[PDB]
Amino acid sequence: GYLVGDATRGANLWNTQTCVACHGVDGERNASGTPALTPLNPNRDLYRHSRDTQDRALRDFISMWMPQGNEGSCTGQCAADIEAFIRTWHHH
Ligand code: HEC
Ligand code: NA
């Protein structure tokens, strides 16, 4: 049925699936202290990529659209886990 995302695993996949390169550690900053190349707002109810035709759940946005340039590399449980991780950011 509906996969259950694990935020702790998503914190690791954030790096290994290369999200960190474009979005920094937290959608705001890089480890180096410079601003992220592309911000990521972790608090939208739904996400609509500029090339999409409808709003998506965060995990489905990730499956379809990210990492940009190699979108098929994170789907399914990867996408669920990273969704869960991103939804922890407003507790930062
Ligand atoms: C640079 C090569 C990127 C990599 C690697 C990843 N993302 Fe990305 N992301 C990138 C761009 C240019 C954009 C904008 C897309 C558009 O609408 O044209 C995004 C957007 C996101 C968002 C939405 C952010 C928002 O504030 O609405 C999310 C949630 C997102 N990206 C997630 C994400 C994840 C989980 C990645 C690793 C699997 C990832 N991105 C990689 C550029 C790049
Ligand atoms: Na994907």
Numbering used by the authors: 1 to 92
The authors write:
Here we analyse a small c-type cytochrome (CjX183) present in Cellvibrio japonicus Cbp2D, and show that it can initiate bacterial CuII/I LPMO reduction and also activate LPMO-catalyzed cellulose-degradation. Here, we have determined the structure of the isolated X183 domain (CjX183) from this protein, confirming it as a typical c-type cytochrome that most likely has an electron transferring (rather than a catalytic) function.
CjX183 was expressed in the periplasm of E. coli with the aid of the pEC86 vector which codes for the cytochrome maturation machinery to allow the insertion of heme into the protein. The red coloured protein was subsequently purified to homogeneity, crystallized and the structure determined to 1.2 Å resolution. The structure reveals CjX183 to be an α-helical c-type cytochrome domain harbouring a single heme molecule, which is covalently linked to the conserved CXXCH motif via thioether linkages to Cys19 and Cys22. Two additional cysteines (residues 74 and 78) are present towards the C-terminus of the domain and these form a disulfide bond, presumably to stabilise the protein in the extracellular environment. The central heme iron atom is coordinated by a proximal histidine residue, His23, and a distal methionine residue, Met66 in the typical configuration observed for class one c-type cytochromes. Interestingly, the edges of the heme molecule appear to be largely solvent exposed, however, the propionate groups form hydrogen bonds with Arg44 and Ser50 located in a surface loop which extends around this part of the molecule. These interactions may account for the relative stability of the reduced state discussed later. CjX183 aligns to the electron transfer domain within TsdA, suggesting a similar electron transfer role for CjX183 as is typical of this cytochrome class. Analysis of these signals indicates that they arise from a one-electron redox reaction that is attributed to the reversible FeIII/II chemistry of the heme within CjX183. This experiment suggested that in principle CjX183 is capable of activating LPMOs because the extracted midpoint potential (+193 mV vs SHE) sits below the reduction potentials that have been reported for LPMOs (typically greater than +220 mV vs SHE). The complete oxidation of the heme in CjX183 took ∼2 h demonstrating that it remains reduced in the presence of O2 for an extended period, even though the structure reveals that the heme is quite solvent exposed.
